[PDB]
């Protein structure tokens with residue numbers, strides 16, 4: 001049945017709650033972003049109102065074939081009324097189209113649901129600064145102090161310089177980047193840009209990216225693999241077997257693969273700096289795991305909450321075990337005592 005942390009009190013609303021069948025008394029289903037754990041259950045047979053960003057609405061229509069009449073896209077940073085309740089969608093700094101949702105309850109309570117987010121100081125200057133938030137439904141994916149990672153900028157710098165060096169030394173090297181969902185497009189787009197190539201991909205992935213309002217996308221991506229030296233593949237195929245195979249398919253155009261796997265976190269972060277990352281190599285194939293995250297680090301998350309000063313925090317991730325729930329609650333208390341709220 002629908003968990004409490006997907007229900008918005010004082011409303012008929014749910015957030016990211018599409019796999020429970022008809023939720024009793026739900027009048028509007030909100031979707032924060034187009035990732036499968038959140039959209040699971042939508043299809044062309046869904047006949048309730050779905051509220052979301054424009055980009056998420058493009059992906060619902062084109063990829064899942066949801067009918068137009070049930071998709072209600074809203075502009076960002078704009079006060080809107082939904083079943084008589086004022087709402088605002090804010091940029092979540094997650095994947096394309098991902099939003100946070102501010103609800104202004106008729107009784108005066110103000111609720112922020114972060115969806116999935118990567119907290120950033122820029123958020124401290126959006127419409128959030130203008131009023132107090134009483135309840136926060138928080139993306140706690142990496143809510144433990146061992147989760148540190150570099151900025152997105154530093155990670156792309158590493159990937160560009162690595163790819164550019166390799167291909168300049170060997171003009172017959174192929175670059176491959178793994179993907180399994182939208183997000184992290186900057187990885188493959190920045191590499192193609194430095195190399196003066198388009199990124200080649202399957203028809204299904206080219207379709208997905210054409211839904212995202214990315215400026216000058218017809219200029220950066222293509223379904224012609226032959227004319228491209230940056231290839232995108234499913235994340236599952238980013239291993240020595242899968243890559244030796246792909247190389248066979250390129251018909252002696254290439255003699256070396258350099259591959260990137262943008263993971264969220266991996267324990268090499270606790271020790272290793274970004275400067276100090278090395279690949280796994282077999283034969284003429286090298287694989288780099290880079291820590292490109294679209295979720296908050298522990299320190300980024302802590303700053304955001306100590307800035308916002310909510311009266312109540314409701315975690316949405318890692319809620320399935322008592323030890324996790326209990327540990328998160330202890331961090332929330334420290335933050336509150338250190339900051340004085």
Ligand code: NI
Pocket residue numbers: 033035094116
């Ligand atoms: Ni997500």
